[PDB]
Design a protein around this ligand. Structure first.
Ligand SMILES: Cn1cnc(Cn2c(=O)nc(Nc3cc4cn(C)nc4cc3Cl)n(Cc3cc(F)c(F)cc3F)c2=O)n1
Ligand SMILES: Cn1cnc(Cn2c(=O)nc(Nc3cc4cn(C)nc4cc3Cl)n(Cc3cc(F)c(F)cc3F)c2=O)n1
Lengths: 302, 306
């Protein structure tokens, strides 16, 4: 029983974190095989941040401008290339701690664990969701760049996020491991603002199914709804519209609980018009949206 | 900026998790040097667990009954003994991934990370607080026994918790690494209920500081109070008393933010009576009591753990 926001064990990723220094800039790098991945803005200087010409600054660089440190062992950069917004440094030793891994681009609503790192030393691990506006509500201090977000599946580590910047609103923006940003953001110090955020409706429904599995009983109702009537109400509360794809994803949870998806949608609808009247669901008095339908199945009973 | 529930990087502990099997019972073990630690209830049958004599159950068992699985390599038990509610299995090989470690016992309100495992395979990590009633609000499914709770200081892993059982109310109970239970529980199949829990007050104030550091400042008032006046109100609302030691611990947060604790207690005092009036603090609609003052300083000052 119980229900906690749970992160993945971070050991496989801890063995890959290194320190990348270029000039005075020091951030974290992800060391897989004989390549260290890190945000390309590490080659920028105080002046080259508002409008950096990264191709010009990199063709500009020699391998011995980069200092890579795995613990007290300085790796030797033997080559450096750029792929979109990630820098790739070839090093002369493959990381013997490299796990089975792949690079995956995730979609808004998907969750992942983030290993916060400073000077290449892991500091803590937590759970995140890719917001519908392509930001993440992280916990990051200066020097956290290069920290990665991941999932683990049968000792295979899917890397799906690398941290680059903090936006004015306090949220954070990053890329996948191929250097493509999530969202309309760029690795520049120019004026940048994220879209208005919305609640991941499919995740809340999943969480509500998790409450019933754990026996929570107070929010459901005798009502059902049409997909369009629900979406009409939800959008008026800054909730993401729900598509038939989402309804399909919830299928297994609905099957396990004997509560149809559109029945539960009617329960979310009522919850949005009444509130929760002092009560809580799985210990929360707000609706949680950082549990996917996959997560709910993994952590909950059967 | 930002603020999250954060656990210690679990890697040092992951290299110590093994699967222990006794008969049909199978749970997790902690492999440190040439000893494997796990709950003693593994030697129990579905009826001996109702009322056992762990003494006699143990001595009757032999070494080859304990299947100690380290991933897939099998470990050879060359001895076994008890220490309170934790069983100890001596194996022929010392764990080469053994971290710099010690066994500590924590107080209520102190936090730790938990590495939930199943069949010796680490599955997820999360951050707990020992509740005042000596339970922890965990997320465990069957197979989780032997999952361990720890803290990391520099390169030292401090093991402080081992999971044993879930209570009928859903919360969880276990021992320190020396077998001593946390709270008034026994490792037996009987009717056991959790005592009435309370709010870790010093952790709520520490969380309010984290909110201020993140610029969430609406709850700050203008008033100040006294420990007496606060604690009189706090007892009514099932809040833990705030001691003089608690105030000194909030010292650095106080000086970093310009908000003297007791001034902060006035804010928490108001929040306790008037509620939050449809507002939120760090996005949460409840007062968060699972962040210690050191937790807050650690997370807002970037301290790493190698
Ligand atoms: C508060 N916060 C939360 N996450 C972040 C991420 N982040 C960061 O870690 N560092 C940044 N600037 C640097 C300055 C340096 C000074 N020295 C000596 N070394 C430095 C290294 C960095 Cl990496 N930034 C700012 C930033 C980073 C970018 F990648 C970008 F495109 C624009 C930016 F304004 C930062 O956001 N900070
Ligand atoms: C859902 N949940 C989450 N945490 C818990 C605690 N807990 C547990 O995890 N396992 C238990 N019995 C086992 C049966 C097994 C059958 N096989 C094949 N392997 C098994 C392993 C275990 Cl560990 N129990 C029961 C239990 C064990 C005790 F030590 C005790 F004092 C009281 C109890 F009710 C359990 O509570 N469940």
């Amino acid at each position: 029983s119980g229900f906690r926001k749970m992160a993945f064990p971070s050991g496989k990723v801890e063995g890959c974190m290194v320190q990348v220094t270029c000039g005075t800039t020091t951030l974290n790098g992800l060391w897989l095989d004989d390549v260290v991945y890190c945000p390309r803005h590490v080659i920028c200087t105080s002046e080259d941040i508002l409008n950096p010409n990264y191709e010009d600054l990199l063709i500009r660089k020699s391998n011995h401008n980069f200092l890579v440190q795995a613990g007290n062992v300085q790796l030797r950069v033997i080559g450096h290339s750029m792929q979109n917004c990630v820098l790739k440094l070839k090093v002369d030793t493959a990381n013997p701690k490299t796990p089975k891994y792949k690079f995956v681009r995730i979609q808004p609503g998907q969750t992942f664990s983030v290993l916060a790192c400073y000077n290449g030393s892991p500091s803590g691990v937590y759970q995140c969701a890719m917001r519908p506006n392509f930001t993440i509500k992280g916990s990051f201090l200066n020097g956290s760049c290069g920290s990665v977000g991941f999932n683990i599946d049968y000792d295979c580590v899917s890397f799906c996020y690398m941290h680059h910047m903090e936006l004015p609103t306090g949220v954070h923006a990053g890329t996948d491991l191929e250097g493509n940003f999530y969202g309309p953001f760029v690795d520049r110090q120019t004026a940048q603002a994220a879209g208005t955020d919305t609640t991941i409706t499919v995740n809340v429904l999943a969480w509500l199914y998790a409450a019933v599995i754990n026996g929570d009983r107070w929010f459901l109702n005798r009502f059902t709804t049409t997909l369009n009537d629900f979406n009409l109400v939800a959008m008026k509360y800054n909730y993401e519209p729900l598509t038939q794809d989402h309804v399909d994803i919830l299928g297994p949870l609905s099957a396990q609980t004997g509560i149809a998806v559109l029945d539960m949608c009617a329960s979310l609808k009522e919850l949005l018009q009444n509130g929760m009247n002092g009560r809580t669901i799985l210990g929360s008095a707000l609706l949680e949206d950082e549990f996917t339908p996959f997560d709910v199945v993994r952590q909950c009973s059967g």
